[PDB]
Design a protein around this ligand. Structure first.
Ligand SMILES: [Zn+2]
Ligand SMILES: [Zn+2]
Ligand SMILES: [Zn+2]
Lengths: 119, 123
């Protein structure tokens, strides 16, 4: 009797693209690299607070957060933050070390255990 | 050699629960029945503007929108709005006509096509 229309497969890229746009943000994320603010991004608290992986970024709208990362892991930060939206992430043997360090530091427990397996 | 961690199966209910909570809204939706404001909901423009199905609700934060619906279709409005978040919707023979009317009037084109096809299957 019940029929379901299911277009939820579109959600991962719809949310990923919200991050990519950097429009309508309500959270500022500064990326500290050995004492200096090397990178910046903005976030959407409505999306981030719905995700247990992004608990380090659970703040009220209008807030500012500071992340600290090592120079070698800078090219992986954008991918980590997009993963908090899309809930999808591509990991290689050359990036596993950095994603394990980032996930441990920010308590993204699903990603942390996934990288640990690949070590 | 690439390995993909994919937890996107959680997205539908994570977004559905944002609508259910009615917290952190930036859009007011009034449902008008026969000239009177019968019921109300609040929305999240960050989620709605990312969805082509939710076109009729593409507004700037702080806006107020009014939806006119027939009295018989009032029990279906919550499910239509939740569908704009979750991208999942349950349709029965007793609800198909109301979802087809709502989808047509508000331009939810994927749902409109689905109701039209489902009706041919059920009857
Ligand atoms: Zn069937
Ligand atoms: Zn693998
Ligand atoms: Zn039809």
């Amino acid at each position: 009797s019940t029929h379901t229309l299911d277009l939820s497969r579109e959600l991962s890229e719809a949310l990923g693209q919200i991050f990519d746009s950097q429009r309508g943000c309500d959270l500022s994320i500064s990326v500290n690299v050995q004492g200096e603010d090397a990178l910046g991004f903005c976030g959407h608290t409505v999306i981030l607070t719905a995700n247990l992986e992004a608990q380090a970024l659970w703040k009220e709208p209008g807030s500012n957060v500071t992340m600290s990362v090592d120079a070698e892991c800078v090219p992986m930060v954008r991918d980590l933050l997009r993963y908090f939206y899309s809930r999808r992430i591509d990991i290689t043997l050359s990036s596993v070390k950095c994603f394990h360090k980032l996930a441990s530091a920010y308590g993204a427990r699903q990603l942390q255990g996934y990288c640990a397996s690949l070590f």
